[PDB]
Design a protein around this ligand. Structure first.
Ligand SMILES: O=C(O)Cn1cnc2c(Br)c(Br)c(Br)c(Br)c21
Length: 327
Protein backbone atom coordinates (compact mmCIF):
# COMPACT_ATOMS: atom_id res chain seq x y z
CA UNK A 1 0.00 0.00 0.00
CA UNK A 2 1.03 3.69 -0.72
CA UNK A 3 -0.66 7.00 0.11
CA UNK A 4 -2.68 8.29 -2.84
CA UNK A 5 -1.58 11.95 -2.06
CA UNK A 6 1.58 13.48 -0.68
CA UNK A 7 3.50 10.19 -1.04
CA UNK A 8 6.66 11.90 -2.21
CA UNK A 9 6.88 14.76 0.27
CA UNK A 10 9.79 13.29 2.26
CA UNK A 11 11.38 11.83 -0.89
CA UNK A 12 11.78 15.30 -2.32
CA UNK A 13 12.73 17.18 0.88
CA UNK A 14 16.26 17.41 2.27
CA UNK A 15 17.12 14.46 4.42
CA UNK A 16 17.38 16.85 7.40
CA UNK A 17 13.65 17.67 7.23
CA UNK A 18 12.66 14.09 8.15
CA UNK A 19 15.79 12.63 9.74
CA UNK A 20 14.69 13.61 13.26
CA UNK A 21 17.43 11.51 14.94
CA UNK A 22 20.03 13.95 13.52
CA UNK A 23 18.27 16.90 15.39
CA UNK A 24 20.43 18.89 17.87
CA UNK A 25 18.08 20.37 20.43
CA UNK A 26 18.67 24.03 21.23
CA UNK A 27 17.66 24.44 24.91
CA UNK A 28 16.15 27.64 26.17
CA UNK A 29 16.14 29.01 29.63
CA UNK A 30 13.97 27.09 32.08
CA UNK A 31 13.56 30.13 34.35
CA UNK A 32 11.81 32.05 31.60
CA UNK A 33 8.63 29.95 32.23
CA UNK A 34 6.75 29.42 35.45
CA UNK A 35 3.91 26.97 36.11
CA UNK A 36 0.58 28.58 37.11
CA UNK A 37 -1.79 25.55 37.27
CA UNK A 38 -2.10 21.99 36.02
CA UNK A 39 -4.54 21.55 33.07
CA UNK A 40 -3.97 18.04 31.70
CA UNK A 41 -2.11 14.76 31.97
CA UNK A 42 -1.54 11.58 30.20
CA UNK A 43 0.68 8.62 29.94
CA UNK A 44 3.61 10.66 28.49
CA UNK A 45 3.22 14.17 29.94
CA UNK A 46 1.70 16.55 32.45
CA UNK A 47 0.41 19.80 31.09
CA UNK A 48 0.21 23.19 32.80
CA UNK A 49 -0.86 26.70 32.06
CA UNK A 50 2.25 28.85 32.60
CA UNK A 51 3.52 32.35 32.28
CA UNK A 52 6.55 33.68 30.36
CA UNK A 53 8.14 35.87 33.07
CA UNK A 54 9.82 38.14 30.50
CA UNK A 55 6.68 39.31 28.83
CA UNK A 56 3.97 38.13 31.23
CA UNK A 57 2.24 36.25 28.38
CA UNK A 58 0.44 32.94 29.00
CA UNK A 59 1.82 29.67 27.66
CA UNK A 60 1.29 25.98 27.92
CA UNK A 61 4.03 24.00 29.56
CA UNK A 62 4.21 20.29 28.74
CA UNK A 63 6.47 18.50 31.13
CA UNK A 64 7.54 15.14 29.60
CA UNK A 65 7.65 11.94 31.55
CA UNK A 66 10.84 9.80 31.09
CA UNK A 67 11.15 9.08 27.45
CA UNK A 68 13.79 7.83 24.91
CA UNK A 69 15.91 10.35 23.08
CA UNK A 70 14.52 9.17 19.72
CA UNK A 71 10.89 9.78 20.68
CA UNK A 72 11.49 13.32 22.05
CA UNK A 73 13.44 14.32 18.98
CA UNK A 74 10.60 12.99 16.74
CA UNK A 75 7.97 15.14 18.48
CA UNK A 76 10.23 18.25 18.48
CA UNK A 77 11.17 17.93 14.86
CA UNK A 78 7.59 17.40 13.73
CA UNK A 79 6.44 20.42 15.82
CA UNK A 80 9.27 22.60 14.33
CA UNK A 81 8.39 21.52 10.82
CA UNK A 82 4.67 22.23 11.28
CA UNK A 83 4.85 25.43 13.35
CA UNK A 84 2.89 28.24 11.64
CA UNK A 85 0.50 25.87 9.75
CA UNK A 86 -3.29 26.39 10.08
CA UNK A 87 -4.62 25.32 13.45
CA UNK A 88 -1.44 23.50 14.43
CA UNK A 89 -0.29 24.14 18.06
CA UNK A 90 2.83 26.39 18.06
CA UNK A 91 5.98 25.14 19.79
CA UNK A 92 7.77 28.27 21.05
CA UNK A 93 10.63 26.92 23.18
CA UNK A 94 12.13 23.73 24.67
CA UNK A 95 13.75 23.77 28.16
CA UNK A 96 14.94 21.34 30.76
CA UNK A 97 15.73 21.00 34.44
CA UNK A 98 19.46 20.98 35.00
CA UNK A 99 19.61 18.39 37.77
CA UNK A 100 16.99 15.84 36.59
CA UNK A 101 17.16 16.66 32.85
CA UNK A 102 13.36 16.59 32.70
CA UNK A 103 12.37 18.35 29.50
CA UNK A 104 9.45 20.77 29.00
CA UNK A 105 7.97 21.85 25.73
CA UNK A 106 6.62 25.38 25.70
CA UNK A 107 3.60 26.25 23.48
CA UNK A 108 1.49 29.32 22.65
CA UNK A 109 -1.41 29.35 25.09
CA UNK A 110 -4.78 27.91 24.05
CA UNK A 111 -7.92 28.52 26.19
CA UNK A 112 -9.79 25.22 25.77
CA UNK A 113 -13.21 24.05 26.83
CA UNK A 114 -13.70 20.32 28.04
CA UNK A 115 -15.11 18.56 24.95
CA UNK A 116 -17.47 16.45 27.08
CA UNK A 117 -19.34 19.62 28.12
CA UNK A 118 -18.81 21.59 24.87
CA UNK A 119 -19.93 19.08 22.29
CA UNK A 120 -23.57 18.77 23.63
CA UNK A 121 -23.94 22.52 23.09
CA UNK A 122 -22.56 22.78 19.55
CA UNK A 123 -25.11 23.62 16.88
CA UNK A 124 -25.17 21.80 13.53
CA UNK A 125 -23.28 24.80 12.00
CA UNK A 126 -20.66 24.76 14.77
CA UNK A 127 -19.97 21.01 14.08
CA UNK A 128 -19.44 21.81 10.41
CA UNK A 129 -17.25 24.74 11.24
CA UNK A 130 -14.92 23.02 13.77
CA UNK A 131 -14.59 19.83 11.69
CA UNK A 132 -13.57 22.09 8.72
CA UNK A 133 -10.98 23.82 10.86
CA UNK A 134 -9.61 20.44 11.99
CA UNK A 135 -9.43 19.29 8.37
CA UNK A 136 -7.28 22.37 7.57
CA UNK A 137 -4.80 21.15 10.15
CA UNK A 138 -4.86 17.51 8.83
CA UNK A 139 -4.43 18.52 5.19
CA UNK A 140 -1.58 20.76 6.23
CA UNK A 141 0.29 18.14 8.21
CA UNK A 142 -0.28 15.46 5.53
CA UNK A 143 1.00 17.96 2.90
CA UNK A 144 4.12 18.30 4.99
CA UNK A 145 4.72 14.53 5.05
CA UNK A 146 3.39 13.93 8.56
CA UNK A 147 0.64 11.65 10.00
CA UNK A 148 -0.72 12.70 13.38
CA UNK A 149 -1.79 9.20 14.42
CA UNK A 150 -3.75 10.28 17.53
CA UNK A 151 -6.72 12.34 16.32
CA UNK A 152 -9.47 12.31 19.06
CA UNK A 153 -11.47 15.07 20.84
CA UNK A 154 -8.93 15.20 23.66
CA UNK A 155 -6.30 16.41 21.18
CA UNK A 156 -8.44 19.05 19.55
CA UNK A 157 -8.40 22.21 21.73
CA UNK A 158 -11.44 24.49 21.10
CA UNK A 159 -11.90 27.96 22.57
CA UNK A 160 -15.65 28.22 21.79
CA UNK A 161 -15.96 31.86 22.73
CA UNK A 162 -13.28 32.73 20.18
CA UNK A 163 -14.14 29.92 17.71
CA UNK A 164 -10.52 28.89 17.61
CA UNK A 165 -9.24 25.33 17.22
CA UNK A 166 -5.68 23.80 17.58
CA UNK A 167 -4.60 20.16 16.91
CA UNK A 168 -2.28 19.27 19.78
CA UNK A 169 -0.16 16.30 21.09
CA UNK A 170 2.10 15.44 18.26
CA UNK A 171 3.82 12.79 20.47
CA UNK A 172 2.57 9.88 18.32
CA UNK A 173 3.03 11.55 14.96
CA UNK A 174 5.42 10.15 12.27
CA UNK A 175 6.83 11.03 8.91
CA UNK A 176 5.32 9.16 5.97
CA UNK A 177 7.71 7.21 3.71
CA UNK A 178 6.26 5.03 0.91
CA UNK A 179 6.25 1.33 1.85
CA UNK A 180 7.42 1.84 5.42
CA UNK A 181 5.93 -0.57 7.95
CA UNK A 182 4.82 1.42 11.03
CA UNK A 183 3.94 0.35 14.58
CA UNK A 184 0.18 -0.24 14.83
CA UNK A 185 0.16 0.64 18.54
CA UNK A 186 -0.89 4.18 17.89
CA UNK A 187 -4.08 6.26 18.37
CA UNK A 188 -6.64 5.89 21.16
CA UNK A 189 -8.62 2.59 20.96
CA UNK A 190 -11.97 4.23 20.05
CA UNK A 191 -10.25 6.05 17.13
CA UNK A 192 -8.07 3.26 15.79
CA UNK A 193 -8.64 2.45 12.14
CA UNK A 194 -9.23 -1.04 10.89
CA UNK A 195 -5.64 -1.08 9.49
CA UNK A 196 -4.29 -0.91 13.07
CA UNK A 197 -6.74 -3.51 14.28
CA UNK A 198 -5.87 -6.06 11.60
CA UNK A 199 -2.06 -5.38 11.68
CA UNK A 200 -1.70 -3.70 8.30
CA UNK A 201 1.53 -1.83 9.02
CA UNK A 202 2.04 -0.01 5.74
CA UNK A 203 -0.61 2.56 6.44
CA UNK A 204 -0.59 6.28 5.72
CA UNK A 205 -2.24 9.68 6.29
CA UNK A 206 -5.63 8.05 5.69
CA UNK A 207 -5.44 6.62 9.24
CA UNK A 208 -6.16 10.19 10.50
CA UNK A 209 -9.28 10.30 8.30
CA UNK A 210 -10.77 7.21 9.96
CA UNK A 211 -10.09 8.83 13.41
CA UNK A 212 -11.72 12.06 12.13
CA UNK A 213 -14.78 10.09 10.90
CA UNK A 214 -15.11 8.43 14.43
CA UNK A 215 -15.02 11.96 16.00
CA UNK A 216 -17.56 13.25 13.50
CA UNK A 217 -19.87 10.26 14.01
CA UNK A 218 -19.70 10.84 17.75
CA UNK A 219 -20.67 14.51 17.26
CA UNK A 220 -23.61 14.09 14.87
CA UNK A 221 -25.06 11.06 16.61
CA UNK A 222 -24.32 12.35 20.13
CA UNK A 223 -22.70 8.98 20.98
CA UNK A 224 -19.35 9.43 22.73
CA UNK A 225 -17.38 7.49 21.62
CA UNK A 226 -19.10 6.12 18.61
CA UNK A 227 -17.33 2.69 18.45
CA UNK A 228 -17.05 1.66 22.10
CA UNK A 229 -14.73 -1.32 22.29
CA UNK A 230 -13.18 -2.52 25.52
CA UNK A 231 -9.91 -3.90 23.97
CA UNK A 232 -8.43 -3.96 20.44
CA UNK A 233 -10.27 -7.10 19.45
CA UNK A 234 -13.58 -5.83 20.72
CA UNK A 235 -12.90 -2.54 18.83
CA UNK A 236 -12.86 -4.40 15.49
CA UNK A 237 -16.04 -6.23 16.53
CA UNK A 238 -17.82 -2.89 17.29
CA UNK A 239 -16.79 -1.61 13.84
CA UNK A 240 -17.82 -4.86 12.06
CA UNK A 241 -21.27 -4.77 13.69
CA UNK A 242 -21.88 -1.35 11.94
CA UNK A 243 -19.97 -1.63 8.65
CA UNK A 244 -20.78 -5.43 8.21
CA UNK A 245 -18.36 -8.38 7.69
CA UNK A 246 -18.74 -8.55 3.90
CA UNK A 247 -16.82 -5.28 3.50
CA UNK A 248 -14.28 -6.59 6.00
CA UNK A 249 -13.60 -9.74 4.07
CA UNK A 250 -13.21 -7.79 0.86
CA UNK A 251 -10.67 -5.50 2.53
CA UNK A 252 -8.74 -8.40 4.11
CA UNK A 253 -8.56 -10.24 0.77
CA UNK A 254 -7.36 -7.11 -1.13
CA UNK A 255 -4.41 -6.62 1.27
CA UNK A 256 -3.87 -10.36 1.76
CA UNK A 257 -4.30 -10.21 5.50
CA UNK A 258 -5.63 -13.04 7.60
CA UNK A 259 -7.12 -12.41 10.98
CA UNK A 260 -5.79 -14.23 14.04
CA UNK A 261 -8.24 -17.10 14.44
CA UNK A 262 -9.45 -15.79 17.82
CA UNK A 263 -10.16 -12.41 16.31
CA UNK A 264 -11.88 -14.06 13.37
CA UNK A 265 -14.03 -16.04 15.81
CA UNK A 266 -15.02 -12.89 17.80
CA UNK A 267 -15.97 -10.83 14.78
CA UNK A 268 -18.49 -13.42 13.54
CA UNK A 269 -20.89 -12.40 10.76
CA UNK A 270 -22.78 -9.12 10.56
CA UNK A 271 -24.85 -7.33 8.02
CA UNK A 272 -24.12 -3.69 7.23
CA UNK A 273 -26.26 -1.37 9.33
CA UNK A 274 -27.55 1.79 7.61
CA UNK A 275 -26.32 5.11 9.22
CA UNK A 276 -29.90 6.12 9.89
CA UNK A 277 -30.28 3.31 12.40
CA UNK A 278 -28.46 5.80 14.76
CA UNK A 279 -30.62 8.94 14.58
CA UNK A 280 -32.87 9.67 17.51
CA UNK A 281 -34.52 12.65 19.24
CA UNK A 282 -31.47 14.19 20.95
CA UNK A 283 -29.33 14.38 17.74
CA UNK A 284 -31.94 14.73 15.08
CA UNK A 285 -31.25 18.45 14.33
CA UNK A 286 -27.60 17.55 13.50
CA UNK A 287 -28.17 14.57 11.24
CA UNK A 288 -28.80 15.30 7.45
CA UNK A 289 -28.19 13.37 4.11
CA UNK A 290 -25.06 15.62 3.61
CA UNK A 291 -23.70 14.60 7.03
CA UNK A 292 -24.34 10.94 6.39
CA UNK A 293 -22.84 11.13 2.93
CA UNK A 294 -19.71 12.86 4.28
CA UNK A 295 -19.50 10.31 7.22
CA UNK A 296 -19.94 7.28 4.93
CA UNK A 297 -17.01 8.51 2.80
CA UNK A 298 -14.69 8.64 5.85
CA UNK A 299 -15.66 5.39 7.68
CA UNK A 300 -14.55 2.84 5.02
CA UNK A 301 -12.47 -0.19 5.96
CA UNK A 302 -10.25 0.32 3.02
CA UNK A 303 -7.97 3.19 3.86
CA UNK A 304 -7.40 3.83 0.14
CA UNK A 305 -11.11 4.53 -0.39
CA UNK A 306 -11.50 7.21 2.34
CA UNK A 307 -11.65 10.89 1.44
CA UNK A 308 -8.39 12.75 1.71
CA UNK A 309 -8.48 15.78 4.01
CA UNK A 310 -8.39 18.14 0.96
CA UNK A 311 -11.34 16.21 -0.62
CA UNK A 312 -13.21 16.32 2.68
CA UNK A 313 -12.86 20.15 2.86
CA UNK A 314 -14.60 20.43 -0.56
CA UNK A 315 -17.53 18.16 0.32
CA UNK A 316 -20.84 20.06 0.06
CA UNK A 317 -21.54 19.41 3.71
CA UNK A 318 -19.09 22.35 4.30
CA UNK A 319 -20.47 24.69 1.64
CA UNK A 320 -21.64 27.27 4.11
CA UNK A 321 -18.36 27.29 6.04
CA UNK A 322 -16.47 27.84 2.77
CA UNK A 323 -18.85 30.58 1.66
CA UNK A 324 -18.42 32.35 5.00
CA UNK A 325 -14.67 32.11 4.85
CA UNK A 326 -14.54 33.53 1.30
CA UNK A 327 -15.75 36.80 2.93
O1 LIG B 1 -0.45 16.76 25.32
C1 LIG B 1 0.03 17.75 24.69
O2 LIG B 1 0.75 17.98 23.68
C2 LIG B 1 -0.18 19.01 25.30
N1 LIG B 1 -1.38 19.14 26.00
C3 LIG B 1 -2.05 18.36 26.88
N2 LIG B 1 -3.14 19.04 27.32
C4 LIG B 1 -3.07 20.25 26.68
C5 LIG B 1 -3.86 21.36 26.68
BR1 LIG B 1 -5.32 21.23 27.82
C6 LIG B 1 -3.57 22.46 25.90
BR2 LIG B 1 -4.70 24.00 26.00
C7 LIG B 1 -2.46 22.49 25.08
BR3 LIG B 1 -2.14 24.05 24.01
C8 LIG B 1 -1.61 21.40 25.02
BR4 LIG B 1 -0.05 21.51 23.89
C9 LIG B 1 -1.97 20.31 25.86
Amino acid sequence: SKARVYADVNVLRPKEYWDYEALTVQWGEQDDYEVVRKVGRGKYSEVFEGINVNNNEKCIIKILKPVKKKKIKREIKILQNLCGGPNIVKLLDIVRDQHSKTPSLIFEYVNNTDFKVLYPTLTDYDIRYYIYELLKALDYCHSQGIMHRDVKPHNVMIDHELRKLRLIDWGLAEFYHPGKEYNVRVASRYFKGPELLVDLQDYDYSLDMWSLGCMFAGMIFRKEPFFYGHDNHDQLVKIAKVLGTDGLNVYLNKYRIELDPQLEALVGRHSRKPWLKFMNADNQHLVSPEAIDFLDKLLRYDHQERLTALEAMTHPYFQQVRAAENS
